[PDB]
């Protein structure tokens, strides 16, 4: 969705930044710019002028304290983001064709635990949806503009789930109902939905989340919720091995065979917690 | 055209994932998103064209011998992985990994690909791995295995400071279209 551009969020710290040292921006870069690219560019510019062992990136997204900060250094945090849209704002973006518009509210999201970590298991793993807010909306004269409101949004253990989910349930919507279609994506896809080899691959998400329903109703919103996106997820891997095996040719048999013993292994383990 | 298959194999635990998704999804390894999942993929541009890159994440143990080869038909490019201050997963590489995908696939071309490389240039770590009778493996040292087993090229990266990762990624595309 780099229709609209690419986006980072642009924070300076330290004195020797001048009129910069503590503000923040949201620069625009051309579509398909990554992370690497602008911190290379960004502190490779600041260590032309203040020296090379000064600039310090901080590789980090969620807020900023200054007393951790060696007040001689200059440090820059970068930070991509996306824009955000109402569920109004969106819908419009899909039926009139152009788009590219108002743009001034871009998000990213950080991830930690209580305990103060980055990661955690998944019944540990918290996640920050944080909001910013720009002083003016892109495209716009200038290629940067700076932000002047924030909101942060806290989703809860269950939550993150639900997301991962919802956006793997769509990465195979999305392959299988493609024209012309791409194998090598599509298997990719699927290979990893149903043949996790590193990491713990969704049926370890259902037993966590899916083997007590709660007491509390706050949290049923939440469990039952969960449930549903694992019934229209194990619909959409038959409906993509089913669209997998039209394409193989012979070589990948036992590949795709493979394929199918995982699934039906998984739907078989699932269906307990799903009903 | 379409996709390219890049198959990326290499010891567990020397940050091949870490590397990987943090490449793809524009974090550091401090804000990456966790996932359940595995596979990733990324639109790389290269010459004023965009190329997609499916990048396959295959386990590294022993258990998992018998499955993973399942992934190399129609691969198109391979990434073999060590941390360059992990001297058994260089070893490693000589005497299981290439062996390996050059058995199934003796016409797809691969990469060596070094990591960490900021623990290298780290004081603690190689004062660590010396008092073990071991240092870390220079460019030097990684850059003849490669030529001694014909892969396009080595390229290191670092996860942690992006350096040299987009070249991993860029030659992976390069060494595939040809």
């Known amino acids: ?197 590193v990491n713990q691959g969704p049926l370890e998400v259902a037993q966590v989340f899916l083997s007590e329903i709660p007491s509390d109703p706050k949290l049923f919103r939440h469990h039952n919720k969960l449930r549903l996106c694992f019934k229209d997820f194990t619909k959409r891997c038959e409906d993509a091995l089913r669209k997998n095996k039209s394409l193989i040719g012979p070589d990948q048999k036992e590949y795709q065979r493979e394929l199918e013993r995982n699934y039906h292994r998984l739907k078989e383990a699932l269906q307990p917690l799903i009903n | 055209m379409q996709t390219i298959k890049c198959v990326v194999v290499g010891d567990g635990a020397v940050g091949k994932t870490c590397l990987l998704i943090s490449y793809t999804t524009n974090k550091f390894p401090s804000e990456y998103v966790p996932t359940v999942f595995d596979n990733y993929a990324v639109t790389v541009m290269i010459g004023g064209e965009p190329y997609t890159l499916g990048l396959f994440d295959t386990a590294g143990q022993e258990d998992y011998d018998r499955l993973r080869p399942l992934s190399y038909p129609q691969t198109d490019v391979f990434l073999v992985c060590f941390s360059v201050v992990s001297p058994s997963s260089f070893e490693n590489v000589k005497e299981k990994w290439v062996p390996e995908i050059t058995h199934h696939c003796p016409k797809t071309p691969f990469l060596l690909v070094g990591t960490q490389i900021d623990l290298r240039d780290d004081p603690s770590t190689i004062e660590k791995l010396a008092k073990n009778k071991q240092k870390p493996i220079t460019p030097e040292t990684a850059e003849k295995l490669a030529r001694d087993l014909k892969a396009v090229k080595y390229v290191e990266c670092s996860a942690l400071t992006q350096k040299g990762l987009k070249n991993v990624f860029d030659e992976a595309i390069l060494a595939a279209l040809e």
């Open chain 1, 1 to 197: 969705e780099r229709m609209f551009g690419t986006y980072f969020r642009v924070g300076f710290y330290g004195t020797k930044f001048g009129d910069l040292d503590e503000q923040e921006f949201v620069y625009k870069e051309p579509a398909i710019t990554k992370l690497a690219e602008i911190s290379h560019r960004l502190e490779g510019f600041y260590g032309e002028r203040f020296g090379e062992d000064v600039v310090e990136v901080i590789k980090d997204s969620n807020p900023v304290d200054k007393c951790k900060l060696d007040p001689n250094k200059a440090y820059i945090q970068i930070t991509y983001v996306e824009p955000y849209f109402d569920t109004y704002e969106m819908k419009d973006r899909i039926t009139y064709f152009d788009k590219n518009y108002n743009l001034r509210r871009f998000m990213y999201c950080t991830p930690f635990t209580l305990d103060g970590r980055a990661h955690g298991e998944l019944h540990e793993q918290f996640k920050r949806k944080t909001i910013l807010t720009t002083s003016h909306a892109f495209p716009y004269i200038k290629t940067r503009v700076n932000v002047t409101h924030k909101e942060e949004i806290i989703l809860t253990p269950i939550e993150v789930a639900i997301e991962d989910m919802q956006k793997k349930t769509q990465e195979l919507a999305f392959a299988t109902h493609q024209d012309p279609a791409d194998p090598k994506m599509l298997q990719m896809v699927l290979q990893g939905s149903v043949g996790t080899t």
